[PDB]
């Protein structure tokens, strides 16, 4: 399993950077100074690579959400904790969001890509739901459609990470952060 | 211009429906029933192929956006009608999707992409914009920042086309239509 981890790791992160179609199993290889042999004993078909990159996702997602909003007993906190781990900042949460972006196109495609898009998608979804729910029982947030509310901040999460990922002239991660806050504010809270 | 307009109109098509890096020179070729050095000869790159792709697709919408909106002299249907032009309808439309998914993807690795997608999506941002200045002129529209409005409703956008794209379980052109002119009536309309 270490070897595996490590090339699990490895091919995620060149999928995010240099995107899934540009990177063949030798620049895995290489990466590692191991033979394309090996990186087959693990990963049959370079499909399985990009799956198991969104599986990578999907995990990294769900673990970081688990650790950092179970504990936040205020559901205002706690929504707005959750757009921040969402935001594509430098490093891995850039990384993820590239990830993310070639999956939603794959997904246009592939319907195993697609099924599991919509597997992850729709637990990400259902977090924000919640996340609303809880905060109208709470007093705290506004008796609106919980599901038309986290289809549209989910809409706009994604649609405002696109402009940062792409460089929409006076898009940063702090706009988007300011953005999101404004709505929840203004469309959420109560 | 004829062949070049044909071979064009192909390969755009093809990336739409396989995939940029899915498509060869001798795919484009086989479908016009054509050489590899003839695509070569009006295409000197792979890389400028996706580039008059994304070029093709700018005209594509402006194109569409003159002929059906400076007619419209109310600014509240003209908003719907606009709004109504992005959908991503079977055929083109979805096809028009598919290439701006792949974009955004190259956008986040080429320069040139970049560019010129950052282009086309401000003058996207734009009309969008002036339509809402349009709107508050006329008294239809609420006086909030229209760059911000605009900000939001193209985010808006372009996160509930992923999830039409992408087979959201329950989302359909029709719900996507649905939230966008929701949105428009309770949060722009006065």
């Not at 697609?114 to 729709?122: E, G, I, T, W």
Request: include cysteine.
């Amino acid at each position: 399993s270490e070897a595996r981890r490590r090339i699990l790791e490895t091919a995620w992160r060149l999928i995010a950077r240099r995107g899934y179609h540009n990177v063949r199993i030798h620049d895995i290889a290489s990466e590692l100074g191991t033979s394309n042999a090996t990186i087959h004993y693990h990963f049959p078909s370079k499909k399985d690579i990009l799956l198991e990159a969104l599986r990578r996702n999907v995990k990294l997602a769900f673990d970081r959400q688990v650790a950092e909003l179970h504990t936040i007993a205020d559901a205002r906190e706690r929504l707005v904790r959750l757009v921040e781990l969402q935001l594509p900042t430098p490093g891995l949460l850039r990384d993820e969001w590239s990830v993310w972006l070639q999956v939603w196109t794959e997904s246009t495609l592939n319907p195993k890509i697609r099924d599991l898009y919509n597997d992850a998608y729709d637990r990400w979804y259902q977090t924000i739901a919640m996340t609303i729910r809880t905060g109208q029982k709470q007093g705290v947030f506004r008796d609106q459609d919980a599901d038309e509310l986290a289809t549209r901040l989910s809409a706009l999460i994604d649609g405002l990470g696109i402009q940062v990922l792409t460089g929409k002239r006076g898009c940063s991660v702090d706009h988007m952060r300011q953005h999101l806050n404004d709505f929840i504010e203004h469309n959420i809270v109560e």
